Amino acid sequence: MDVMNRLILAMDLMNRDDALRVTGEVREYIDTVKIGYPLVLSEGMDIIAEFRKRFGCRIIADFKVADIPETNEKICRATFKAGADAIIVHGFPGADSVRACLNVAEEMGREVFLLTEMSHPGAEMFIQGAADEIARMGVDLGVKNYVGPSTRPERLSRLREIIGQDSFLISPGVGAQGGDPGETLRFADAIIVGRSIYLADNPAAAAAGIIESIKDL
Amino acid sequence: VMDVMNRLILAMDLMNRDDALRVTGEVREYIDTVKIGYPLVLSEGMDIIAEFRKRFGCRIIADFKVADIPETNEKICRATFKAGADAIIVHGFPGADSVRACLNVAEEMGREVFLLTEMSHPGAEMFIQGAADEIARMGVDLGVKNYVGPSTRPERLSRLREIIGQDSFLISPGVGAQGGDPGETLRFADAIIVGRSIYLADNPAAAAAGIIESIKDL
Ligand SMILES: O=c1cnn([C@@H]2O[C@H](COP(=O)(O)O)[C@@H](O)[C@H]2O)c(=O)[nH]1
Ligand SMILES: O=c1cnn([C@@H]2O[C@H](COP(=O)(O)O)[C@@H](O)[C@H]2O)c(=O)[nH]1
């Protein structure tokens, strides 16, 4: 995936008007938008097509897919039907649940992003201890896209080591959660940024500022 | 605790509005509690919850297996309860803060959180099973009163019931299609969750009635 400015906008505003207005204000800086349940459950899945129609941006559905294989398949199908280019799936539920997602993605010409370790403090309780193994599982399954924590650069670096330089890695937790844009890009191909941009007084200036700080990258 | 009619919860995972409504309507006399998940919600919209409330006199459990960071979990719960869901199912593996975020919204909005400890599918044995007992204990420490456990592993369901105590409410999926037995599951769970065995049957009503007849003494 070729992400403009190595910056993915996490559009978690829950109002259609605000989401569209803010995204439009920073459109010149991005071409990849991560849409999650906050916006989808508030405005409906048709919002995905609206974004593609207005911005032509690629859409990553951050649905943290974490159900049994049968249900995961249905979730992916509904998501790709809505126009999502990729979907984020949890690895904690096991290999069969991830495979179900990979099957649908292959069938519809989309990509699966495997979330190995999360960025919040609670991730240390159960996810972190299984993260490396989840990453190895991704490798065994042929997964090429991963999600790792900006909040723990050493952990993000370990994830990169496991998956190799060829795999694609995106990373959330930048800004609001404490992650540094430049440091995160030492290991991730692209950073995910939400609040630092969409909650800023001037979203455009916020995005421009982040890009300025990583201009050499 | 919620009074689930016939201790049977319908997992309505059909993705077509017309079919979902038809089938739910046909088993309406046997079930007053319906679990709606993403297969239907992502296909027909959150308003489907509103439509089910209007058409049937059923409680709604949103099986969204909430598994994000605290900030995002709060937003998901708010949107879900705003839509009319009585309760929401949340994953415990992402940690205490993520669960607490859901509990806080449920408390302020007057709704309930169901904590999913162990899952019923084969893959659950890779990472979830090993953390299940601790996730359950965490739920008890956090004040969680409603839980979800696997019918496919009676031994595990029994242990979960022990950890949460007799006062906690426990519902269990994996019955029918996945192999779980209704009666045996009800030895530990307050109610069983059944999807495909009912909604894919030539006669959903007869399928539901059959399951209920098999557990009549319970
Ligand atoms: O480990 C993870 C996985 N996903 N996200 C998601 O990435 C975005 C981060 O946004 P923020 O910049 O506003 O913190 C949100 O949509 C959140 O659900 C995380 O923050 N951490
Ligand atoms: O551990 C779990 C948690 N949730 N479910 C959900 O419960 C329902 C089971 O339906 P079934 O009777 O068709 O297998 C589906 O909605 C599925 O996502 C499980 O099966 N196992």
Side-chain angles (χ1 to χ4, degrees), chain A residues 187-198:
Chain A
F187 314 112
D189 293 285
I191 50 174
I192 292 169
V193 180
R195 288 167 288 173
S196 288
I197 292 177
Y198 76 69

Side-chain angles (χ1 to χ4, degrees), chain A residues 10 12 34 62 64 118-119 172 174 177 193-195, chain B residues 68-69 72:
Chain A
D12 297 310
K34 186 178 75 65
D62 187 0
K64 302 292 195 298
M118 288 179 75
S119 69
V174 180
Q177 301 181 64
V193 180
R195 288 167 288 173
Chain B
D68 218 300
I69 64 172
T72 295

Side-chain angles (χ1 to χ4, degrees), chain A residues 60-214:
Chain A
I60 297 177
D62 187 0
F63 292 177
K64 302 292 195 298
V65 187
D67 217 301
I68 66 176
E70 179 63 57
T71 297
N72 276 13
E73 187 194 312
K74 293 179 172 180
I75 292 178
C76 291
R77 191 154 298 183
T79 299
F80 296 142
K81 279 184 165 55
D85 295 289
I87 193 169
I88 294 172
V89 182
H90 263 295
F92 211 80
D96 56 355
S97 287
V98 176
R99 175 57 63 184
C101 299
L102 290 169
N103 295 326
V104 180
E106 185 180 66
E107 175 168 51
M108 300 181 75
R110 314 302 162 84
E111 295 296 326
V112 166
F113 274 76
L114 184 63
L115 175 58
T116 61
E117 187 175 322
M118 288 179 75
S119 69
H120 66 301
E124 300 187 317
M125 288 188 74
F126 308 111
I127 297 178
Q128 189 176 73
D132 282 19
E133 194 178 339
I134 290 177
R136 292 197 299 279
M137 174 188 75
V139 176
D140 291 324
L141 290 175
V143 175
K144 298 181 179 179
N145 302 288
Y146 299 82
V147 186
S150 166
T151 54
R152 306 190 190 89
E154 82 278 32
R155 293 297 300 146
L156 188 60
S157 177
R158 182 56 184 143
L159 173 54
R160 169 58 75 187
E161 297 183 324
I162 299 171
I163 65 177
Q165 302 295 63
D166 291 61
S167 297
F168 194 65
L169 176 60
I170 63 180
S171 180
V174 180
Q177 301 181 64
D180 181 80
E183 287 296 290
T184 304
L185 290 175
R186 288 172 56 187
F187 314 112
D189 293 285
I191 50 174
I192 292 169
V193 180
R195 288 167 288 173
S196 288
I197 292 177
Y198 76 69
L199 285 188
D201 292 299
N202 187 321
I210 293 174
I211 296 173
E212 183 73 299
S213 71
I214 60 171

Side-chain angles (χ1 to χ4, degrees), chain A residues 5 8 13:
Chain A
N5 290 149
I8 296 173
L13 287 173

Side-chain angles (χ1 to χ4, degrees), chain B residues 22 43 54 67 90 103 106 112 145 170 176 197:
Chain B
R22 184 191 67 260
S43 295
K54 178 181 179 180
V90 180
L103 291 173
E112 294 269 62
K145 305 184 301 177
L170 175 61
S197 286

